[PDB]
Amino acid sequence: QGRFRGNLSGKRVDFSGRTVISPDPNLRIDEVAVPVHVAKILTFPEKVNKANINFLRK
Amino acid sequence: MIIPVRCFTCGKIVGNKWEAYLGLLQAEYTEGDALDALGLKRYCCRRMLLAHVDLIEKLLNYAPLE
Amino acid sequence: IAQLRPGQEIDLLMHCVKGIGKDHAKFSPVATASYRLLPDITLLEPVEGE
Amino acid sequence: VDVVHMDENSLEFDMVGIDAAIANAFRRILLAEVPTMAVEKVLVYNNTSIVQDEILAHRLGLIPIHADPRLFEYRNQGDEEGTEIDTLQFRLQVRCTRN
Amino acid sequence: TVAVMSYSGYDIEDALVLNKASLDRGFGRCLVYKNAKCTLKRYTNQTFDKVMGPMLDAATRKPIWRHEILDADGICSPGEKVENKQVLVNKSMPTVTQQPQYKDVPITYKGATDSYIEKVMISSNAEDAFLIKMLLRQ
Amino acid sequence: TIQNSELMSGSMDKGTLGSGSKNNIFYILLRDWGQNEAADAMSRLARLAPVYLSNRGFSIGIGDVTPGQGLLKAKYELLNAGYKKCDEYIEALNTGKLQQQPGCTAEETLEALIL
Amino acid sequence: QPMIYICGECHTENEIKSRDPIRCRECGYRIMYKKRTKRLVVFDAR
Amino acid sequence: KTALEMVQAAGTDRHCVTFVLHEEDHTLGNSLRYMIMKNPEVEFCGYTTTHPSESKINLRIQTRGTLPAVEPFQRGLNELMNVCQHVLDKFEASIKDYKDQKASRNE
Amino acid sequence: MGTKANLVTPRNGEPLIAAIQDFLTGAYLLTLKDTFFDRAKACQIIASILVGKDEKIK
Ligand SMILES: [Zn+2]
Ligand SMILES: [Zn+2]
């Protein structure tokens, strides 16, 4: 638990989650179904520009 | 703890059969005849009385009381 | 429903509503309801003797 | 349709000429779409038994009520009190004493 | 009642399909009891931790939402429900590090979902410390 | 044999759909027609094959691993023959001449013959 | 208007009002449980 | 609030349309498919639940000739409704006859 | 790092994202020489794919 092995090599990150997995074939192979109680917490900072002002107001 | 009201699989009301089931096992029936005489044809109803442990008769000895 | 010992008391108040069985299994009216197709065992050759 | 047997709380009847995709619909409507009456809100005053409050409310939910549910209407969204039309009300009160 | 068949493809690697009606009638229903304890110690100075009552809203004569479930002695009561960030034992300690000054160190309910307080035990040791144990239930 | 995306003969093993090796039809779709068609095909199969299978019914029971009579005869004959030849090899080591295999001691020869 | 505690062993009301060590009035048992609240709670039957 | 939504195909004018039925499941879907496939103008008919969390079915109907697929859908609904009416009448008559025959015997 | 762009493992070039149990057994029991379907069940099996982005196709 020093600086090198504890904090430089691999460090903890935020904007992450951890849940039990369960199968669902009805999705495409490049989709994952995130629960609602995790997607309300995890956020993506979307900068406001001309293309999505009306989306971000809603 | 206590007998469930309905059978888990089909849905027949089993929770009233328990006091009759112990009453028929006081009069020396086998379990196989008692479950027939109570009228449980499907075996999902039969496992509700054949496999049930009555813990609440032995949990109520430990409840605080006046 | 429950089972008691002296000193213990249950005093509650229940509200029955109307509901369908799709929402919860306590609204279903049937113990079970099924169907089977009516058989016809038929004999190909005559079965005689033992 | 030929009814072969019937008594209280049971029925058994033959159907000839209907197809599987309609008789299956009659079975599924009987399991999941014929409405009845069952307890939803259990308002509790002074439950001091060993049966926990959640499990007791769940046991009271499963008890069949002999109301004829063609006479009642669906309760709306919310509306926790209810009116004459869309609910019943049952009151349980048991106190246990020594003989 | 276990069928052994392949059904709907949601059961691929060891997963198993349940029944909704069996789950509603009581299959696999489980209670979870947790604990929440608070100690009220007496210091080397003759000063003691104390439990304040519910801090009322004077505007409406109702306690505030963070203290909604408290009894009149600052200790939460059996039967009522707890949500996230409510208090259970309204502890306060001396900041002696002339009159004693108190800061609030309540014992809050951290949790994802609602709970039911089943019993609150209150007892002591011989050192005049008060032990308070709640038994929560989901 | 798949020709112009029409299966003309033969059944789909693991060696034609599974994740084992090449000659996977999804690998053919990946190398010849891009990633999008391989992904669409895998999604369509994962969508379709349980809808067939859960209306066919596919089950295993104790009647499916029970041995017939033709096995219960042959197993008894095989065990009697093998135990006789093992006993003759044991007797040929302990109280006689045992033909030693090259490159090893006599007991290792006995272990190899019994295995 | 006071607080009333149920004794652990003998099931009696004890009414601990003074700053005392916790003790049953009739027995010597030293564990108190609170009574059940008077307010009502609403459960879904699900 | 609308429970019926009609999604047409990409290039075909109204003779290959996909009916999205909100707030149904396999119950109406299978019976309605059975009554549609009896119509000999329907080449393809079959439903699918979109996802089991959702109460939708997508009922694709593809006709042979030039008639739009709304007419086999309407004929399938009306034929299923008339089947249910006739079954209700015959079943109520058989129940009344059974109760009458039982109440006439052993009296 | 997409799923569609990593269908093949870098180790030897054999695919990893492919069908697994109950998708192999379904396709094996679908593609025997024994199975035959009427028009009703064939339409019912084919119509399971008409969902997602394949909802608009004929
Ligand atoms: Zn049963
Ligand atoms: Zn005492």
Q: Which residues of C touch B66 (CB under 8 A)?
A: 6-7
> With contact defined as beta carbons under 8 Å apart, do F52 and I25 qualify?
no
CB contact under 8 A, G45 and C26: yes
CB contact under 8 A, B4 and E22: no
Q: Residue type at C37?
A: L
Whether B28 has its CB under 8 Å from any CB of chain C: the answer is no
Q: Which of D6, D25, D32 shows the shortest C-beta gap to H98?
A: D6
Q: Which residues of G touch C26 (CB under 8 A)?
A: 45
Least Cα separation, residue A31 to chain I (angstroms): 9
The count of structural domains within chain B is 1
- E112: CB partners within 8 A, 6+ apart: E84
Question: What is the C-alpha separation between F30 and G17, in angstroms, rounded?
Answer: 81
Q: Which residues of I touch E6 (CB under 8 A)?
A: 22, 25-26
Structure tokens at B58: 């032995």
Contacts 24+ apart (CB under 8 A), C19-24: C19/D35, C19/D36, C19/D37, C19/D38, C19/D40, C19/D74, C20/D32, C20/D33, C20/D34, C20/D35, C21/D31, C21/D32, C21/D33, C21/D34, C21/D35, C21/D36, C22/D32, C22/D33, C24/D38, C24/D61, C24/E24, C24/G46
Nearest to F39 by CA among I53, D62, E34: I53
Q: Hey, which residues 13-72 in chain E have their CB within 8 Å of chain I?
A: 13
Least Cα separation, residue E82 to chain D (angstroms): 14
Neighbours of chain D (3+ CB pairs under 8 A): B, C, E, G, H
CB contact under 8 A, F50 and E4: no
* 3-state secondary structure (DSSP) of residue B62: coil
Q: What angle do CA I15, I20, I22 make, to 5 degrees?
A: 155
Resolution of this model in Å is 3.3
Least Cα separation, residue A55 to chain I (angstroms): 23
Q: Residue type at B30?
A: T
Q: Give residue for tokens 């609170």.
A: G34
Mutate which: H30, H36, H42, H47, vs I, most I CBs within 10 A: H47
Q: Which residues of chain E approach chain G closer than 8 Å at the C-beta?
A: 24, 71-73, 75, 77-81, 116, 119-124, 128, 130
Question: What is the C-alpha separation between E103 and C19, in angstroms, rounded?
Answer: 52
> With contact defined as beta carbons under 8 Å apart, do E116 and E137 qualify?
yes
Whether C1 has its CB under 8 Å from any CB of chain E: the answer is no
- Total CB pairs under 8 A between chain A and E: 10
Q: Which residue range(s) make up the domain with G46? A: 1-46
- For residue G44, what is the enclosing H or E element? strand G41-44
Question: What is the C-alpha separation between E131 and E49, in angstroms, rounded?
Answer: 12
- For residue F93, what is the enclosing H or E element? helix F69-94
Q: Which residues of B touch D7 (CB under 8 A)?
A: none
- For residue F14, what is the enclosing H or E element? helix F14-17
Q: Over the Cα atoms of chain A, what is R_g?
A: 18
- Total CB pairs under 8 A between chain E and G: 48
Structure tokens at E13: 């690697």
Question: What is the C-alpha separation between D41 and A52, in angstroms, rounded?
Answer: 45
- For residue D36, what is the enclosing H or E element? strand D36-45
Instruction: Measure G26 CA to ligand 2 centroid, in angstroms.
Output: 5
CB contact under 8 A, F49 and E6: no
Q: Which residue range(s) make up the domain with B28? A: 1-66
Q: Which residues of E touch I25 (CB under 8 A)?
A: 6
The count of structural domains within chain G is 1
- E107: CB partners within 8 A, 6+ apart: E36, E38, E87, E88, E89, E91
Nearest to H26 by CA among D25, F21, F61, E88: D25
Residues recorded for chain E? 138
Q: Residue type at D90?
A: F
- D94 - beta bridge partners? C10
Q: Give residue for tokens 């009233």.
A: B16
CB contact under 8 A, D38 and G41: no
Binding site feature residues of A for DNA: 5, 12, 18
Burial of F59 (0-12, 13-18, 19+ CB in 10 A): exposed
B45 annotated ligand binder: yes
CB contact under 8 A, F39 and A25: no
Instruction: Measure E130 CA to ligand 2 centroid, in angstroms.
Output: 18
Q: Which residues of I touch A30 (CB under 8 A)?
A: 2-4
Residues recorded for chain G? 46
* 3-state secondary structure (DSSP) of residue B6: strand
CB-based neighbours (< 5 A) of ligand 2, an ion: G 7, 9-10, 24, 27, 29
Whether D50 has its CB under 8 Å from any CB of chain B: the answer is yes
Which residue of chain D is at minimal alpha-carbon distance from C10?
Answer: D47
Binding site feature residues of G for Zn(2+): 7, 10, 24, 27
Question: What is the C-alpha separation between D66 and A25, in angstroms, rounded?
Answer: 43
Mutate which: E2, E22, E29, E31, vs B, most B CBs within 10 A: E22
